Design a protein around this nucleic acid. Sequence first.
DNA 1: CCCGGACCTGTGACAAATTGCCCTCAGACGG
DNA 2: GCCGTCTGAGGGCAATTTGTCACAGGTCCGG
Length: 210
Amino acid sequence: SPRIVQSNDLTEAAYSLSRDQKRMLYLFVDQIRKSDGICEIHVAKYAEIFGLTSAEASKDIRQALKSFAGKEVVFYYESFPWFIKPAHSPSRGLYSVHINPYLIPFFIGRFTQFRLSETKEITNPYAMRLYESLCQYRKPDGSGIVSLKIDWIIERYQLPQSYQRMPDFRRRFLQVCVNEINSRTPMRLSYIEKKKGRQTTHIVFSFRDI
DNA sequence: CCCGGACCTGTGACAAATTGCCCTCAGACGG
DNA sequence: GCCGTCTGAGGGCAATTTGTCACAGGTCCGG
Ligand SMILES: [Ca+2]
Ligand SMILES: [Ca+2]
């Protein structure tokens, strides 16, 4: 199945995207890399890759596409829009999109890589961000270890405001997304908390391959 | 000494958002 | 040149997940 690769600058960028949008974004990076910024999406192909009906694919593409407008991307800083023209459909079952050409060098650069079958069952978009950030540190054999700062997680994944209260951070983000990765990917993941005084400051992740 | 305050934790509620499903009906084409 | 079928563009749903905050109970310090 298709092998996604992307510059680390994208793995660690600040942005907020939905799941359907992140799915499309993988195909855009794939199209661009296989060579102006103009990409294309087929309803029937999206449906087959991610196991949807054609109808639900259509719904997913259309709403994802109108939710890109006004969205911006920050590289740590410098801000860019994803799209510089609205999407449009020349043919039935076919969409044309215009990615910001200044983003191309940030897509292709110190890199992260994974096969698309690894992530296509994840549902929570914050868990997709987390799985991308672990892959950036993976060894050939399939293991790794990394320390991510809690303040940096909040900024980069643009977590919502009540998750700055740590018991809520634990309950609705950390525990749920570590559970998804262990249930929906071939990865097996564990963690431990680093503290300073009363405050918890980092999360230390270790993982191996099944 | 206590006591109140500034911190920290987990849980029960409720509100808003997202999920996979289901149904209708016209577009595009082949045979 | 018409119709039978495969698509996909629309309109919705209830059941779950995700986002928010009130309240109870831990600690340590300065007064
Ligand atoms: Ca969201
Ligand atoms: Ca959907």
